[PDB]
Amino acid sequence: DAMIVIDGHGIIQLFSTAAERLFGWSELEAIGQNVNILMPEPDRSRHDSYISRYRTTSDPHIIGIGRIVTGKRRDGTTFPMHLSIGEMQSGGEPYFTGFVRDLTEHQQTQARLQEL
Ligand code: HEM
């Protein structure tokens, strides 16, 4: 599915090709950008703090755990997605891998069955 790998500062290091389709951002555009360019406010501005809370407390809030959140596409549109984070380490520094599963279709179907 879509996969994003960030370092300990929230900077994107690898943006798979499906992520490009899903978010709109190309690989070269994504890499180097902080992951918070993928979420609306208030989380955008506080996403770094969330990561900082975890790097100092060593207390996992959403690691392993799979969570449903709102992603933001390049054209400004938000959408729900399921995200699962796996923590890793390379060259001494920590890295984080996110596996996104688009849920837009599941949210639309649900709204539709609601509406009928
Ligand atoms: C793109 C939509 C995203 C949103 C809305 C989002 C939102 C959040 C929120 C609200 C928190 C804190 C949750 C809590 O402490 O209970 C958090 C933590 C974090 N997020 Fe995200 N996130 C997004 C994507 C990502 C991605 C793609 C990565 C992939 C590496 C990632 C990695 C992290 C990490 C490492 C933390 C800290 C985890 C922790 O405190 O346990 N996030 N995120």
Experimental resolution (Å): 2.6
Class of domain 1-116: alpha beta
- Return the exposure string of 51-60: e unless at least 16 CB atoms fall within 10 Å of the residue's CB, then b: beebeeeeee
Ligand 1 site, CB within 6 A: 4, 6, 35, 38-39, 43, 47, 50-51, 53-54, 60-63, 69-71, 83, 85, 96-98
Q: Specify the ligand 1 atom closest to the Cα of 6.
A: 30
Ligand 1 centre from 83 Cα, in Å? 9
The pair of structure tokens assigned to 107 is 């949210």
Q: Whose CA is nearest to atom 10 of ligand 1?
A: 43
CB 101 within 8 A of CB 109: no
Query: Judging by DSSP bridges, how do beta strands 78-90 and 66-72 pair with one another?
Result: antiparallel
State how far the Cα of 26 lies from the Cα of 38, in Å rounded to an integer: 13
**How far is the centre of ligand 1, averaged over its atoms, from the C-alpha of 69 (Å)?**
9
Q: Enter the tokens of residue 37.
A: 């360019």
Helix boundaries (H) for the chain: 17-23, 27-30, 43-57, 104-115
ω into 94 cis (within 30 of 0) = no
Longest dimension (CA), the chain: 54
